[PDB]
Copies of this chain bind each other. A is one copy, B any other.
Amino acid sequence: QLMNFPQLPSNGIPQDDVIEELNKLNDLIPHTQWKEGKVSGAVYHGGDDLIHLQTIAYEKYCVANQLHPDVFPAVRKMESEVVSMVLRMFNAPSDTGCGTTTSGGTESLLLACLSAKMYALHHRGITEPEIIAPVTAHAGFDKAAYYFGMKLRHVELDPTTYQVDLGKVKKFINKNTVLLVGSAPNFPHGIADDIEGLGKIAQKYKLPLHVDSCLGSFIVSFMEKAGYKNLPLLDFRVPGVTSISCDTHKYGFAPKGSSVIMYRNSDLRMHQYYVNPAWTGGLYGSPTLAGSRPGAIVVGCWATMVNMGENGYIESCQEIVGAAMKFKKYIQENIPDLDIMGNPRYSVISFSSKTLNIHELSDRLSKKGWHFNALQKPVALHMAFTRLSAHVVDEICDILRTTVQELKSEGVADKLIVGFLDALYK
């Protein structure tokens, strides 16, 4: 049995008695087997070898804190490089094309939102900021409206392609609209909204255009280098594109808790910064929303991108997307009871069904240890393909079986969410 600690021990336990417990924890208390590619997301690589790299890199820069460039210059140099490499993947202006680093993919979105808020509030003085984005967007956009007190307006989609209706959005352009969003790809259905034709509308109403490539990251960019044709534009080559998010801790396989927000020029990110010279403790200047920052993490991110190179994320994209498509084809050819959502061109595959109760089906799967992300409006579920789940041949026959087992069988919910949040500390 493993020992728990309601409070600090009388005497500190040796390092040896610790790692033993660090293993007792992994070995004992059961969990979802991500190592066996049974989770849609969470772990995106899992390679014992890769982990070891970012582990020793962690050790080298364990104390690193981006708050102090004068003390940790190498970390500064490695960030300027990371952002630089990511900028080239999305073909940002080699001239004014700047960028910045963030923690989670969520912080990246909030910084693009704060950028537009304090921008339109500087060139238009909008006292009532208003952000508009697809319903298929990410909760990261729904947070910004809550925190910054902005007005978030959801826009419905095209029932056929499941993309975004570029017409309904026009009906929402106001004197308060500060930015328009285009998830590419979105989290729910993994389908890139019309971006190539969205960099034209942005130019019309002089509004900032943000692309939520947090999920796409190192897949969408390499779709072209992987040898895939008929692919829209999802980046700065689209003149109407302002900012672009990208999670390196996702499909970059970088240490969890590392993403990047990009811009077309510096005067934009200027509005995402915080400046307070008046402060007595000195004169703060957070490039992001955080004070002290985990230097090691970004270093581990820098090391993976080099160890992988441009050739790595190709053999990565080809593999991941390769499986996602094989998956899609199998649930079309076989498993006739399922319905693909739109035309997933990438590594994320979504689907639904009116013949079966998808809600119960999900439970039938989770009971077998396989966890698909449960969706709503419409009620569905998907599988974000990772290197681990890239061993798909198994869970294709698995889902068919489960579907075979299905057909062979004759109020304010706001208060509930808070409950399982408090339950994370007992």
Q: Which residues of A contact B (CB under 8 A)?
A: 4-15, 18-19, 21-23, 25-26, 29-32, 34, 39, 41-43, 45-46, 49, 51-65, 67-74, 76-81, 83-85, 88-89, 98-100, 103-107, 110, 114, 135-136, 138-140, 142-143, 146-149, 186-188, 247, 249-250, 255-257, 266, 269-270, 273-277, 279-287, 289-297, 299, 303, 305-313, 371, 373-377, 413-414, 417-418, 420-422, 424-426
Contact = CB atoms under 8 A, between A and B. Distances in A.
Contacts of A65: 42-43, 256
Given A84-B6, A105-B291, A12 B306 contact: yes
A403 to B, nearest CB: 22
A-B pairs, 3 with minimum CB distance? A12-B309, A257-B294, A106-B291
Contacts of A269: 422
B307 A12 contact: yes
B6 A81 contact: yes
B63 A104 contact: no
B373 A138 contact: no
B375 A417 contact: no
A142 B69 contact: no
A290 B80 contact: no
B414 A275 contact: yes
A62 B255 contact: yes
B72 A31 contact: yes
A52 B46 contact: no
A142 to B, nearest CB: 5
Contacts of A188: 280-282
A276 B139 contact: yes
Contacts of A64: 256
Nearest to A140: B291
A312 B12 contact: yes
